[PDB]
Amino acid sequence: ELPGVTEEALRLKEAALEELAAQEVTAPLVPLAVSAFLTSRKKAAAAELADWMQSPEGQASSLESIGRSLSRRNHGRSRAVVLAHDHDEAIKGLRAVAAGKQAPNVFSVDGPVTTGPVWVLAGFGAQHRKMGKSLYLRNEVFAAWIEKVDALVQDELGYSVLELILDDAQDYGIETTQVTIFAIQIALGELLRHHGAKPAAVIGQSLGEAASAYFAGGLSLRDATRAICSRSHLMGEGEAMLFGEYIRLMALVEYSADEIREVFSDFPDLEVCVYAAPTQTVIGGPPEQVDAILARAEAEGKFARKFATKGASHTSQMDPLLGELTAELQGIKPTSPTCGIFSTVHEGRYIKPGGEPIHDVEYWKKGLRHSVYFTHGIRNAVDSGHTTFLELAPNPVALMQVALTTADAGLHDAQLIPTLARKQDEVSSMVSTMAQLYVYGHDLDIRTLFSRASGPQDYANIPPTRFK
Ligand SMILES: *S(O)(O)Oc1ccc(OCc2c(F)cc(-n3cnc(NS(C)(=O)=O)n3)cc2F)cc1
Ligand SMILES: OC[C@H]1O[C@@](CO)(O[C@H]2O[C@H](CO)[C@@H](O)[C@H](O)[C@H]2O)[C@@H](O)[C@@H]1O
Ligand SMILES: OC[C@H]1O[C@@](CO)(O[C@H]2O[C@H](CO)[C@@H](O)[C@H](O)[C@H]2O)[C@@H](O)[C@@H]1O
Ligand SMILES: OC[C@H]1O[C@@](CO)(O[C@H]2O[C@H](CO)[C@@H](O)[C@H](O)[C@H]2O)[C@@H](O)[C@@H]1O
Ligand SMILES: OC[C@H]1O[C@@](CO)(O[C@H]2O[C@H](CO)[C@@H](O)[C@H](O)[C@H]2O)[C@@H](O)[C@@H]1O
Numbered sequence: 001e002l003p004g005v006t007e008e009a010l011r012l013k014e015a016a017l018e019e020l021a022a023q024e025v026t027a028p029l030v031p032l033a034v035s036a037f038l039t040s041r042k043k044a045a046a047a048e049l050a051d052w053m054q055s056p057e058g059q060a061s062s063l064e065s066i067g068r069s070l071s072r073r074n075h076g077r078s079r080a081v082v083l084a085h086d087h088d089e090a091i092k093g094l095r096a097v098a099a100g101k102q103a104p105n106v107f108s109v110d111g112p113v114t115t116g117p118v119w120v121l122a123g124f125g126a127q128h129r130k131m132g133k134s135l136y137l138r139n140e141v142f143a144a145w146i147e148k149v150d151a152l153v154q155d156e157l158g159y160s161v162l163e164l165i166l167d168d169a170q171d172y173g174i175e176t177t178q179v180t181i182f183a184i185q186i187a188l189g190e191l192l193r194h195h196g197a198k199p200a201a202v203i204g205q206s207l208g209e210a211a212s213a214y215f216a217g218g219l220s221l222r223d224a225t226r227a228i229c230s231r232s233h234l235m236g237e238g239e240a241m242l243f244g245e246y247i248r249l250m251a252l253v254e255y256s257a258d259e260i261r262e263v264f265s266d267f268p269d270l271e272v273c274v275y276a277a278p279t280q281t282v283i284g285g286p287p288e289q290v291d292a293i294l295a296r297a298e299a300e301g302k303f304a305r306k307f308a309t310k311g312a313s314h315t316s317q318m319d320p321l322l323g324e325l326t327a328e329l330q331g332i333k334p335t336s337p338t339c340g341i342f343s344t345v346h347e348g349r350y351i352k353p354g355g356e357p358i359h360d361v362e363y364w365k366k367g368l369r370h371s372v373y374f375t376h377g378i379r380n381a382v383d384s385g386h387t388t389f390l391e392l393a394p395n396p397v398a399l400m401q402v403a404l405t406t407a408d409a410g411l412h413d414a415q416l417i418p419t420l421a422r423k424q425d426e427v428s429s430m431v432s433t434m435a436q437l438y439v440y441g442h443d444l445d446i447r448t449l450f451s452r453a454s455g456p457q458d459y460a461n462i463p464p465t466r467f468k
């Protein structure tokens with residue numbers, strides 16, 4: 001018997017819905033799928049659909065009806081999806097598919113990807129004021145999972161994350177950024193599962209490790225929530241008492257791990273927080289040393305960027321918190337993974353499905369305290385055959401780090417699939433995510449992207465639903 005949705009959440013939700021009702025309805029993004037055993041035949045189907053869609057009868061059919069009909073075809077080896085708001089975009093996109101040409105709304109491949117997708121759970125640097133709000137108001141499944149995490153977090157820390165999502169006046173801090181991005185991560189992944197997708201493996205960075213543990217079957221939703229709540233509040237409370245000589249900055253520098261080993265001989269107190277990309281590393285330490293290594297970087301033409309925090313996670317400054325984190329996590333129950341795990345806590349090494357559990361109290365201490373081996377995990381995934389990396393986040397920050405490691409590992413055409421992004425319609429974005437999973441042959445029931453038909457006008461007069 002968990003807490004319910006707070007009264008203030010409901011209040012904020014009613015105001016938000018009026019805000020939504022009084023806005024101009026935008027044309028939805030529809031996925032149009034064509035496929036064939038042969039790419040040559042796929043291109044002809046795309047040309048035939050474009051022709052019919054140019055005809056008066058095609059023009060008279062809604063995109064949603066056309067796409068619902070396409071979704072009931074057999075789905076062949078060679079695939080394409082044209083994402084469209086109207087008949088113009090669709091016909092344009094289909095002509096590109098027919099012509100073998102690239103367009104920004106078009107995905108087309110000769111055959112499925114060989115290995116299943118890696119779900120990427122990062123989070124840092126992805127937050128913004130209204131993250132998750134639009135999809136909450138507009139997707140029943142997304143909203144159900146948000147509320148499930150909101151009840152658990154309510155019960156664990158005593159406040160409502162859903163109030164933060166719904167109230168535009170409020171913005172996120174070191175604590176609430178983590179628990180709220182977690183909630184968005186859980187809800188995005190369960191929405192994806194709802195339409196048939198699943199992770200082949202998971203990889204986490206810093207914040208996202210708790211969600212990655214849930215989706216890998218290493219911890220119940222309750223214990224994953226305990227993992228992100230204890231981490232988050234200790235970090236925010238600890239960092240707020242940091243002043244003067246106790247302050248520790250974090251910064252991004254264009255140095256590799258090997259460069260760092262040599263550059264750090266001038267900086268005794270600097271530590272590595274995150275190995276982000278082959279030539280991007282996040283360091284932490286006392287402000288004067290951080291300022292000097294930044295100065296050193298910019299003098300060598302390398303770029304460098306100070307983050308906004310008075311404390312540095314994944315350094316020794318976390319040693320005061322570990323005792324309390326240990327106490328708060330007593331009772332969690334680590335379970336055997338149900339998909340692969342690239343563990344950026346354990347130096348980037350792989351854990352097979354059915355392996356021994358890894359997510360014990362010591363795992364969360366080690367993760368908070370020690371470096372995040374993100375680029376090593378990604379490289380390990382590339383080297384064992386993975387090419388599709390799907391990021392669950394309000395903004396696709398980590399995907400840019402993945403691109404750097406995949407290109408550097410020789411993979412020059414990875415499938416980098418984002419989810420949400422500020423200033424992209426959150427329902428469009430999720431359509432596009434699931435349309436890509438389909439093109440590459442990953443698990444996804446494209447039929448579930450369209451509501452159940454309730455009448456013959458929900459179909460179009462094309463195969464497989466031609467009217468007798
Ligand atoms: S944990 O507590 O959440 O700690 C943690 C994890 C990950 C972090 O870094 C994420 C990150 C990153 F690795 C790189 C960038 N990035 C690349 N390029 C730029 N901008 S610039 C100066 O080239 O124009 N920024 C950003 C980012 F958030 C940090 C802490
Ligand atoms: O939602 C827009 C509109 O609603 C008002 C109340 O009429 O404020 C509601 O929404 C705000 C944004 O989330 C909240 O901060 C506020 O608490 C809530 O009452 C208007 O002030 C606003 O223009
Ligand atoms: O501890 C002395 C030792 O560390 C250096 C490294 O640059 O400085 C740091 O330690 C000081 C405390 O003694 C701090 O005041 C300072 O913020 C920190 O960078 C040198 O002073 C020396 O090699
Ligand atoms: O501030 C100077 C410092 O910045 C760098 C880039 O990190 O250069 C920029 O500033 C110079 C002065 O305006 C410009 O001439 C240069 O084109 C610009 O990139 C460093 O090279 C320099 O040390
Ligand atoms: O102030 C640094 C800035 O000055 C330039 C010349 O505009 O370089 C000078 O300073 C360097 C030391 O930082 C010397 O190595 C160099 O010989 C001298 O010309 C810029 O190149 C630099 O960004």
Ligand SMILES: OC[C@H]1O[C@@](CO)(O[C@H]2O[C@H](CO)[C@@H](O)[C@H](O)[C@H]2O)[C@@H](O)[C@@H]1O
Nearest residue numbers: 075437438440441442443444445446447
């Ligand atoms: O080829 C089968 C393979 O395709 C996916 C999507 O990548 O599912 C499609 O094919 C199914 C029929 O085999 C349809 O039920 C489904 O609607 C369609 O997306 C994968 O999920 C499936 O393994």
